[PDB]
Structures are given as structure tokens and as C-alpha cells.
């Protein structure tokens, strides 16, 4: 049974541009669409006109706005934002029926931060205070929500990829998934939930202990899979792998799919590949299994994804086109939105663990499905974690 009907289907979006939830800020409430981001810890909202924003937070119109008299500059590789810190009353209309006083970074200037046509105006960083900007004294939203209300210290995400391109109108009219705040909705997954420990509370850090491509062991020292960390990040599109792991994985995926040759640009995630309508040869592409440390000593479990997760549908014609959604990283493994689309993911902060189950909305075919299976006996799993 599904016990969180009020929160089911409260997300919209897609892997290319992000999944967002409606929120309100200020008095009277100002509605904004906000990116759900498990890879950052600031609640940061557009607060000044921008060519890609149709609306923004207007602090002068909120009677409950409190100015913290402090600026913040946040540069990323992917862009940058500058803002002004304050607090205000915040609600999630399709969430728990509560209003909390939370920190808000009011974005006044930005570079390559906002995405044209994404339909979101801010980011909800759901990770821990350690990585909050400017520092860990800026309490993240979820910490405020738990402290001020009786909402349990857990949230869960079901990101739903359509399996085909959605145009501007369809992506606005379509349900993109669910963010269950304070619980688990059992209608969103099939099979069992398997849990991996949160290694440390900063990002949602986990430990990968084995990687297979179509059941063939990638056979690298497991420290390589987590060099320099492995995280679960709804604010990244792709599955991102450390350089050496990416090189080994692409070699293995090319070998498994060798009956068709794809240009170098496809494997670089830059160029699309197209097939005649309905003829995508899913079967030539391998499944990918990531084994994660279990909660029991010397036990692991695996999550298996299909090419329907790691090939991202894009518009070209009536052809079915895709981009390869696995890419190289110099900051560790990132299990991004395309991986999360295969699973219902439970961020059980209270028990310092992350749960995975097969998603009721994952894209598959009649021959293969995504999977979450276990247990497997795995020794010296702590050695897979990277230090320094
Ligand atoms: C990886 N990153 C992350 N998790 N959060 C940040 C806040 C971020 C995320 C986005 N996310 C996105 O734009 C996005 C796009 C498609 C998706 F499926 C998910 N997220 C945009 C700006 C930004 F600063 C910083 S980042 O280092 O870039």
C-alpha cells in the first residue's frame, strides 16, 4: 500500500534539465519551482531578473524576510552564483503540511547556473551541513524542517524518465516522479529495499565494492571505484566515473556492443546516435551492475541498470535518438539522475543509510528489467573506501 498520496507525483522534469518540486517562500507565499539536489546543501533561489527566469524571489514583498547581512559567492566547475543570505518562511505545497523558517540564499548574480527552459528558479540542496556555503553554520533546509516539525529524518526519491523525448508542453504536463518527505511510499517500487551505509555525512557518500558489465567483472582494485569518493547526486545528469574506471568501463561496453560501431563522439557523450523508429537495439548493449556495501558485515548487494537508463533519449525526423549518459569524472563516482531513474532511492538520514529498490516507473523492455539483488559475500569492503 501507498501511504503518502499527498506527495506522490509531486515532481516534474527530466534527466537533461533536472527534477523539481514546487515550493513557496515568504509572506504572502511566492511560488517557485526548485531543483531537487542531493549533491549540495544550500537552498538557493533566483532573487533578481535573469533572461532564463520567468519569476524570482522578491524579498521586499515578504513581511517575514529576515536579512542576515552576509554575502556568499559559490563557484562550481558547472557555473557560479553570488547571493545574499537571509531567512524566511518556506512551505512545500505537495509535501508535509508544515511551514518552517529556513535559510535562503537570494541569488543576485550568476554565470551558467540557470538553464534555459528547465522550469526551475532555485535549488534545494538536500545534503549535509559540512558542504553548505559559506560554511557548516548555515543550517540546510532539511535540518531546519526536522528540527522545527515532527517530520521524520528521511526522504525518498522516485525520478521517472519517460523513455522518450518530451517536448516543452509535454514536460510541463507530465508527472516526473515523487519526493516523499518523511517516509517511504511502498507503491513506488517493486521487490525489496536493500540498504548501503552512508559512509560519512557530507555528500551522500557510499562505497562501491564491485562493478560488472553483462556479468563480467571489471576487475579493478575496488579503491578505484571510489576514488576520491562515490556519491548519490540527483543534481547531476549522468553516471560519472573516475577516469581509469571510465576508460575500463567504456572499453567493456564497446566490446559488448561490438556488433555496431559508434563514433568516438558518441562515447564522449557529445554526439547523438539514431535508429529508425522503434528499432533501438537495446539487446546489443550490456547491463551494468554496481555492488554496494551492505549493512551486515561482509555482505554486499547489487543494483543493475539497463541501457534504457544509461542511454538518454533526445530529439534529433521520426528516429529514436539517444546520448550516452556515462562520463568521466576527476572528483569520484557520481550516481546521477540517469541511474536514479532506475530505482526508488531512500535517503534514511536517521539510520545513516541509503536504500535502493527497483522503481515502479523504470524504463525497460520485455526481456530485461533493472534489479536490486543480494546478498553476496564480500570481504574487506572498508578497504574499498578512499582516504586522504
Ligand atoms: C553537481 N552539482 C550539484 N549536484 N549541485 C549544484 C548546486 C548544481 C546542480 C545543477 N544541476 C542541474 O542543472 C541538473 C541538470 C539535470 C539533472 F538531471 C540534474 N541537475 C545546476 C547547477 C548547480 F550549481 C552544484 S554542481 O557541482 O553542478
Curated annotation (Swiss-Prot):
Q: Which reaction does this chain catalyze?
A: Broad endopeptidase specificity. Cleaves Glu-Val-Asn-Leu-|-Asp-Ala-Glu-Phe in the Swedish variant of Alzheimer's amyloid precursor protein
- Topological domain spans for side Extracellular: 1-388
Gene Ontology biological-process annotations:
amyloid fibril formation; amyloid precursor protein catabolic process; amyloid-beta formation; amyloid-beta metabolic process; cellular response to amyloid-beta; cellular response to copper ion; cellular response to manganese ion; detection of mechanical stimulus involved in sensory perception of pain
Write the Enzyme Commission number(s) for this entry: 3.4.23.46
Q: Which residues carry this modification: N6-acetyllysine?
A: 70, 219, 223, 229, 243-244, 251
Q: How is it modified after translation?
A: N-Glycosylated. Addition of a bisecting N-acetylglucosamine by MGAT3 blocks lysosomal targeting, further degradation and is required for maintaining stability under stress conditions. Acetylated in the endoplasmic reticulum at Lys-70, Lys-219, Lys-223, Lys-229, Lys-243, Lys-244 and Lys-251. Acetylation by NAT8 and NAT8B is transient and deacetylation probably occurs in the Golgi. Acetylation regulates the maturation, the transport to the plasma membrane, the stability and the expression of the protein.
Q: Which residues are glycosylated?
A: 97, 116, 167, 298
Q: What is its main location?
A: membrane
Q: Which residues form the Peptidase A1 domain?
A: 19-357
Q: How is its activity regulated?
A: Inhibited by RTN3 and RTN4.
Its placement in the membrane is given as: Single-pass type I membrane protein
Instruction: Supply the enzyme class, top level.
Output: hydrolase
Q: Which cysteines are disulphide-bonded?
A: 160-361, 222-384, 274-321
Q: In which tissues is it expressed?
A: Expressed at high levels in the brain and pancreas. In the brain, expression is highest in the substantia nigra, locus coruleus and medulla oblongata.
Q: Which residues form the active site?
A: 37, 233
Entry domain remark: DXXLL motif is required for a proper endocytosis and retrograde transport to the trans-Golgi network, as well as for regulation of lysosomal degradation. The transmembrane domain is necessary for its activity. It determines its late Golgi localization and access to its substrate, APP.
Q: What does this protein do?
A: Responsible for the proteolytic processing of the amyloid precursor protein (APP). Cleaves at the N-terminus of the A-beta peptide sequence, between residues 671 and 672 of APP, leads to the generation and extracellular release of beta-cleaved soluble APP, and a corresponding cell-associated C-terminal fragment which is later released by gamma-secretase. Cleaves CHL1.
* Family, per entry: Belongs to the peptidase A1 family.
The record's note on quaternary structure and interaction partners says:
Monomer. Interacts with RTN1; RTN2; RTN3 and RTN4; the interaction leads to inhibition of amyloid precursor protein processing. Interacts with SNX6. Interacts with PCSK9. Interacts with NAT8 and NAT8B. Interacts with BIN1. Interacts (via extracellular domain) with ADAM10 (via extracellular domain). Interacts with SORL1; this interaction may affect binding with APP and hence reduce APP cleavage. Interacts with NRDC AND NRG1.
* UniProt-recorded name of the protein: Beta-secretase 1
Report the source organism.
Answer: Homo sapiens
This chain is encoded by the gene named BACE1
- In terms of the parent sequence, the fragment covers 57 to 447 of 501
Amino acid at each position: 500500500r501507498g501511504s503518502f498520496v499527498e506527495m506522490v507525483d509531486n515532481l516534474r522534469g527530466k534527466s537533461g534539465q533536472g527534477y523539481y518540486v514546487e515550493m513557496t517562500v515568504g509572506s504572502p507565499p511566492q511560488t517557485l519551482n526548485i531543483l531537487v539536489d542531493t549533491g549540495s546543501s544550500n537552498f538557493a533561489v533566483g532573487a533578481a531578473p535573469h533572461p532564463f527566469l520567468h519569476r524570482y524571489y522578491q524579498r521586499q514583498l515578504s513581511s517575514t524576510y529576515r536579512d542576515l547581512r552576509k554575502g556568499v559567492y559559490v563557484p562550481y566547475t558547472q557555473g557560479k552564483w553570488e547571493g545574499e543570505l537571509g531567512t524566511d518562511l518556506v512551505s512545500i505545497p505537495h509535501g508535509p503540511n508544515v511551514t518552517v523558517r529556513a535559510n535562503i540564499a537570494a541569488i543576485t548574480e550568476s554565470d551558467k547556473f540557470f538553464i534555459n527552459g528547465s522550469n526551475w528558479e532555485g535549488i534545494l540542496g538536500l545534503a549535509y551541513a559540512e558542504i553548505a556555503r559559506p560554511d557548516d553554520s548555515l543550517e540546510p533546509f532539511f535540518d531546519s524542517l526536522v528540527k522545527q516539525t515532527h517530520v521524520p529524518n528521511l526522504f525518498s526519491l522516485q525520478l521517472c524518465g519517460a523513455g522518450f523525448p518530451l517536448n516543452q508542453s509535454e514536460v510541463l504536463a507530465s508527472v516526473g516522479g515523487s519526493m516523499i518527505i518523511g517516509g517511504i511510499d511502498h507503491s513506488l517500487y517493486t521487490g525489496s529495499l536493500w540498504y548501503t551505509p552512508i559512509r560519512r555525512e557530507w555528500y551522500y557518500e557510499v562505497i562501491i565494492v564491485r562493478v560488472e558489465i553483462n556479468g563480467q567483472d571489471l576487475k579493478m582494485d575496488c579503491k578505484e571505484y571510489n576514488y576520491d569518493k562515490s556519491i548519490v547526486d540527483s543534481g547531476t545528469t549522468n553516471l560519472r566515473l573516475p577516469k581509469k574506471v571510465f576508460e575500463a568501463a567504456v572499453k567493456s561496453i564497446k566490446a559488448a556492443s561490438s556488433t555496431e560501431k559508434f563514433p568516438d563522439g558518441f562515447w564522449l557523450g557529445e554526439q547523438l546516435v539514431c535508429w529508425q523508429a522503434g528499432t533501438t537495439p537495446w539487446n546489443i548493449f550490456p547491463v551494468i551492475s554496481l555492488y554496494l556495501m551492505g549493512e551486515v558485515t561482509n555482505q554486499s548487494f547489487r543494483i543493475t541498470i539497463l541501457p534504457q537508463q544509461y542511454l538518454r533519449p533526445v530529439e534529433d525526423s521520426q528516429d529514436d535518438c539517444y546520448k550516452f549518459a556515462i562520463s568521466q569524472s576527476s572528483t569520484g563516482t557520481v550516481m546521477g539522475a540517469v541511474i536514479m531513474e532506475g530505482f526508488y532511492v531512500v535517503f534514511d538520514r536517521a539510520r545513516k543509510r541509503i536504500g535502493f529498490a527497483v522503481s515502479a516507473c523504470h524504463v525497460h523492455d520485455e526481456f530485461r528489467t533493472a534489479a536490486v539483488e543480494g546478498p553476496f559475500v564480500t570481504l574487506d569492503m572498508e578497504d574499498c573506501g578512499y582516504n586522504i
